[PDB]
Amino acid sequence: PTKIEMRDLLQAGAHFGHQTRFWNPKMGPYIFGARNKIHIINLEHTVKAFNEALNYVNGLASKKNKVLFVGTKRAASGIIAEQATRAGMPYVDHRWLGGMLTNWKTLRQSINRLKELEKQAEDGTFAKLTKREALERTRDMQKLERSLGGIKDMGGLPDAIFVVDVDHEAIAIKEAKNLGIPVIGIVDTNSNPDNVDYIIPANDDAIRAVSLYVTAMADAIIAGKEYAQTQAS
Amino acid sequence: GQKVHPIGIRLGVVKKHNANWYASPKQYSEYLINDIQVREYLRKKLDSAMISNIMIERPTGAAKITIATARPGIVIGKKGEDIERLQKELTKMMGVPAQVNIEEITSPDLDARLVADGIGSQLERRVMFRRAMKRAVQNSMRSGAKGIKVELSGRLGGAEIARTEWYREGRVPLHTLRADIDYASVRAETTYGTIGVKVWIFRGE
Amino acid sequence: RNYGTGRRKTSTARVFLAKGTGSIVVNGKPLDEYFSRETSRMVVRQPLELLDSPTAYDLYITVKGGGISGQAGAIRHGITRALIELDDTNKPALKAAGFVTRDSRQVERKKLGLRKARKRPQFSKR
RNA sequence: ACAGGUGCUGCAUGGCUGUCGUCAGCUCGUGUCGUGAGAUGUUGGGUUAAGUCCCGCAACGAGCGCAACCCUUGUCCUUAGUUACCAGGGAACUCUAAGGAUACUGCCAGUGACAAACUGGAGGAAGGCGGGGACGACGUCAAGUCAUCAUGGCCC
Numbered sequence: 001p002t003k004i005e006m007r008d009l010l011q012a013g014a015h016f017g018h019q020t021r022f023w024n025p026k027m028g029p030y031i032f033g034a035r036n037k038i039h040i041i042n043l044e045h046t047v048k049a050f051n052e053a054l055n056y057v058n059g060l061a062s063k064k065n066k067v068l069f070v071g072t073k074r075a076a077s078g079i080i081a082e083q084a085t086r087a088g089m090p091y092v093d094h095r096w097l098g099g100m101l102t103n104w105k106t107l108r109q110s111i112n113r114l115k116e117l118e119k120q121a122e123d124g125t126f127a128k129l130t131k132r133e134a135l136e137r138t139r140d141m142q143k144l145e146r147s148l149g150g151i152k153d154m155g156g157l158p159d160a161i162f163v164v165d166v167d168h169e170a171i172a173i174k175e176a177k178n179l180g181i182p183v184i185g186i187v188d189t190n191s192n193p194d195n196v197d198y199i200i201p202a203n204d205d206a207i208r209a210v211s212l213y214v215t216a217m218a219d220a221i222i223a224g225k226e227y228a229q230t231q232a233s
Numbered sequence: 234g235q236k237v238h239p240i241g242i243r244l245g246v247v248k249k250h251n252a253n254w255y256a257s258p259k260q261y262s263e264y265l266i267n268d269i270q271v272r273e274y275l276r277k278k279l280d281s282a283m284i285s286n287i288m289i290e291r292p293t294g295a296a297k298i299t300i301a302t303a304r305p306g307i308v309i310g311k312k313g314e315d316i317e318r319l320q321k322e323l324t325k326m327m328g329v330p331a332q333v334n335i336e337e338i339t340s341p342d343l344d345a346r347l348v349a350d351g352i353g354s355q356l357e358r359r360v361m362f363r364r365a366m367k368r369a370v371q372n373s374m375r376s377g378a379k380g381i382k383v384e385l386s387g388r389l390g391g392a393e394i395a396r397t398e399w400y401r402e403g404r405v406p407l408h409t410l411r412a413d414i415d416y417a418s419v420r421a422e423t424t425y426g427t428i429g430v431k432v433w434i435f436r437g438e
Numbered sequence: 439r440n441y442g443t444g445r446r447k448t449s450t451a452r453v454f455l456a457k458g459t460g461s462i463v464v465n466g467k468p469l470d471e472y473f474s475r476e477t478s479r480m481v482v483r484q485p486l487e488l489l490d491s492p493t494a495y496d497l498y499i500t501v502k503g504g505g506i507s508g509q510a511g512a513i514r515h516g517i518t519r520a521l522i523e524l525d526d527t528n529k530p531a532l533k534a535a536g537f538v539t540r541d542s543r544q545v546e547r548k549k550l551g552l553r554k555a556r557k558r559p560q561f562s563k564r
Numbered sequence: 565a566c567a568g569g570u571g572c573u574g575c576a577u578g579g580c581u582g583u584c585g586u587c588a589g590c591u592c593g594u595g596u597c598g599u600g601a602g603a604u605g606u607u608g609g610g611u612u613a614a615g616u617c618c619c620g621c622a623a624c625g626a627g628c629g630c631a632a633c634c635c636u637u638g639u640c641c642u643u644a645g646u647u648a649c650c651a652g653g654g655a656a657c658u659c660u661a662a663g664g665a666u667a668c669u670g671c672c673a674g675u676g677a678c679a680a681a682c683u684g685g686a687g688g689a690a691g692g693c694g695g696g697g698a699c700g701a702c703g704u705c706a707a708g709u710c711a712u713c714a715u716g717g718c719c720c
Binding site: 451503 | 636637638639650651652656657658659688689690694695696697
């Protein structure tokens, strides 16, 4: 499961781009054309980009590397979460905090606060707290976890970042360039494909297409894990 | 000049008076004057041993003075021969036996008076005020204070125009009444005038 | 023998309710003789009369402290406290009248530099 | 030797105080942006007495301020009953003075971004900060004080 076919992408509508007015001219190479004033992506390019990206994530998973799933758009909010839990990898779905990575030493305190509060809510320390104050600490837990739920167990900078809709998650791209770590990104036909090491031209707005991309990356990572588990004995 | 004394505003909520006796309206004035005389005599005499919390409590004539110092050995003396002289000198200028029992400060970097007097001695030894201030901050913070603030005010470095400088680390929440903030204010008599040294050490709740 | 304790700004009253003719004796003296204030007399007799039973209960009041109207308020509060004892259906009407609430108003202290609790000295720009 | 000096310089100073102002502000670390001074955070939508709180947001956090912890008053309980009290010697009551209970937007109905919050209602002595106080941020006025005191210098 390292090579995804063109047929399922066509079924999911991974070719529908954006209006011809919002296009990025740097996205010109892999554009089939323009029907009804909407740009069409070249699936020949998309499938090859996916093949290279899947080989890369398979290698990282076989070397036990960590890849951060990033997507905060409505189309990619929950799918990133569930596929990241499947793959055992950190994710960011609610909002990319400015400075998750460049200012990572500071976010350690917030993650540690979340972990301490989870450890006290496990054994149960609400007996010493009042009715309202226990709810105050619980709302602290929920607000802090909603922001940092996927990266609470990342423990250091990831070795790759898989972003959906680079244009939406521009801050992540700039931080990843700042820190030098590779970007596997999905680019619509309106966004900037720069500072993305593994460019995947695709429609990032469709729910089915986003689910297809994220699930495919998840299976590639999981297959890497199963192959890496073959050297135990 | 707009801040209340940290010790005084906390005198009844979490702190305690460092004078615990009872008197009658007529006797109280002379008790207090004798108390202040003993305090000034002690602070001038034991200026070498770093005493910080001389406490005067006099049960029915006989008194039990309690000095807390970071160096009890020097002030007690050899076999305890300086302490006996101090005992009799106290008794001479009070009424009847003043049993001075001497405590020991096991953390001289958490007592504000010791920190302030150290900075003052360094200032009178023509040490850079910024370095002395920063050294005190570091010492207290790594000795375990939950917060330290130190303020140096005066003609710092011989400057014609006096200025106020300060450093803070940790919390030191002055307005919290239950904060357990030790506070000290001493003066360093330099060659250009007096430099005031203020130290707030916040230790808990 | 229902017993009520009423309190006002400085006066404290203790009233004894017992079914009778309607006589009210305050400090061992009749209410009219004790209170030369018509307003104070009305204030004392009001909790009895809002629920249509003035001449139904004999009252023995003992007041202390306060002034002529503070004592009237204290007696009213104590009479309310005693009225709620015999029957709890009178409590909603007493609440609607506002007699069960103890007036917490007290003399505001004189503050420093102020001539009174709130009165400040005259200010001049020049 | 000196002591003594309420002799001078508050524009050499410490300590102390006023004042803007009990106003809600004032900053810092890391990150990011700018050649840079700097910016951001701290802005925006609400909301609050409040940089109060919530939600957004290249910011993430923290500190001093706000609030709370302190004192007094408002109801009740408990220990106690004299020199206090007086319902029938009593141990009821007031009171006295220690320790606590209660009040938390806790419950109901609506409005509100599925929020913070606001509006009204019940219960209660007290309802939203119950009333009053103390507590006065970084700093400003070369503000006041060398005549409380201490002190550099000048002077007798």
